[PDB]
From a paper:
The active sites invariably consist of (i) a catalytic DEDDh/y-containing core for divalent cation coordination and catalysis, (ii) a leucine residue that wedges between the two bases of the substrates and (iii) a 5′-phosphate cap that coordinates the 5′ phosphate of the dinucleotides. Here, we identified a novel DEDD subfamily, members of which function as dedicated deoxydinucleases (diDNases) that specifically hydrolyze single-stranded DNA dinucleotides in a sequence-independent manner.
The biologically relevant assembly in all crystal structures was determined to be a dimer using the ePISA server, which was consistent with the oligomeric state of the proteins in solution. A comparison of structures of apo- and dpGG-bound diDNaseRho revealed no major conformational changes in the protein upon substrate binding (RMSD value of 0.45 Å for 1604 main-chain atoms of a diDNase dimer). First, region 142KTPRLS147 appeared disordered in the apo structure of diDNaseRho, but became visible and folded into a small helix when the substrate was present, owing to the direct interactions of the region with dpGG.
Author numbering:
A (entry chain A), B (entry chain A): 10 to 141, 147 to 213
Write the structure that this text describes.
C-alpha cells in the first residue's frame, strides 16, 4: 500500500491520480524554512489506491510529480499547503494549480484555536483519531515509511468534512477563493514581497 | 467634467462605464477604519468622459454603482483597493470583481519604498505630477469637488505605466493574481479572519 520511489512519482500513480482527480500530498524536510532547508521526500496518496514516498534526487526533476502539481484537473489536498508548496517552489520551480489546504480551511472555521488547525487536532476532533527523523538516510525504515504515509492517508476524510462545515456556514466560497490564492502567496514569499494587501 | 450625484451613479455613467470597460474609483470617509467609520462619497471616473462624485445616502442602495463594482466586464482601478473596498463591503455588502490596485502593484515593484506606493509618490515618479475635509457637509464646495476628483483622474495613466513595468519584470502575472485576491482579502477582513496563509 506504500512504495518508496526514487526520483519521481511512478507512471502508475500518475495515471491513478488522473483517474481519481484528487490526491493528497505532504513532504518531509530537513527543517522549517522552505527557502533554506532541504526537501527530502514528497508523499502522494491516491484515495483507494495507496501512497508513494518520492525520494528527491537533486540531479533529477520529478517530472510526473510536477505534472500532477501543475494539473488543473487534479485537486491536490495538503494539511499545510503554503509550507509544502514553498519547498516545491524553491526546490523545483514548481507552480501548482488546484491546491486545497486543511489548515487554511480550519483557520477560516476556527480562527482562534491553533490546536484545531493542525492535522492532529483535526483528526482528533473530527475522526476521533490520535496521530502518533533522518529522512535523508540511505534507506527508509519500515517505521519511517509507515509514519511518512499517515498524514496523507488521513487527510481525504478530513478535507471532505471541512468542506461540509464550510458549506453549512456559507464560508466555502471564501475558502475556495483562499485556496485559489495559495500559489500566488507562495510566489510572494519566494520573491520576499511580504504583505501586498496592507495600506 | 465633474458632477456631484445624490445616492447613486447616474444611468449615463453606468452606460459610459460599460462602453469603456475600465473605470477608476476612490472614496472619501470620516476616518481610516473601513468597518467603523463613515463612507461619505464614492468617486468614479470614466476615461475620456469625466468624473462623478456619488454622495452616499444611508436610506438608498447605490444600485448602479454596485452593478459597476460587481461587473466582471468592467475593470475598477483603485489606488488603495483594500481600503476602499472595505468601506464598500461594510456599508453596502458590496462584493467587487475585476479590481486592480496601484498600491498592490507598487508593493510588488518596490516593496521597500513606502513613499512610492502612494498615489502621490507614483504620480510624482512616473508623471512628474505633484498632487496637492468635512465630506458630510450639506454642500460640497468647488474646492472639495475639484480635490475629490484629482486622484481618480490621474490613476489611469499610472495604472497603464505600472502594467508595463510589471510586464517588463515578468511580474504582471503575479500582480494579476494578487488583484484577483483583493475581494477575498476584503472578505477575510470583514469576518476578522486574519492571515489564513501562515503556518
Amino acid at each position: 500500500t506504500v512504495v518508496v520511489r526514487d526520483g519521481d512519482l511512478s507512471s502508475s500513480f500518475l495515471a491513478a491520480a488522473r483517474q481519481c482527480g484528487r490526491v493528497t500530498i505532504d513532504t518531509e524536510t530537513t527543517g522549517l524554512s522552505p527557502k533554506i532547508d532541504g526537501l527530502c521526500t514528497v508523499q502522494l496518496h491516491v484515495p483507494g489506491v495507496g501512497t508513494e514516498i518520492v525520494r528527491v534526487d537533486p540531479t533529477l526533476q520529478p517530472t510526473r510529480l510536477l505534472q500532477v502539481l501543475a494539473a488543473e484537473e487534479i485537486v491536490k489536498g495538503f494539511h499545510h499547503a503554503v509550507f509544502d508548496l514553498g519547498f516545491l517552489r524553491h526546490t523545483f520551480q514548481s507552480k501548482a494549480r488546484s491546491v486545497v489546504c486543511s489548515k487554511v480551511a480550519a483557520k477560516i472555521l476556527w480562527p482562534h484555536d491553533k490546536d484545531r488547525q493542525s492535522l492532529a487536532g483535526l483528526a482528533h476532533l473530527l475522526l476521533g483519531v490520535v496521530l502518533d527523523s533522518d529522512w535523508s538516510q540511505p534507506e527508509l525504515t519500515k517505521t519511517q515509511v509507515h509514519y511518512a504515509a499517515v498524514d496523507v492517508e488521513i487527510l481525504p476524510p478530513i478535507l471532505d468534512e471541512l468542506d461540509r462545515l464550510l458549506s453549512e456556514r456559507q464560508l466555502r466560497e471564501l475558502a475556495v477563493a483562499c485556496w485559489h490564492h495559495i500559489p500566488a502567496h507562495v510566489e510572494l514569499l519566494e520573491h520576499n514581497l511580504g504583505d501586498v494587501f496592507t495600506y
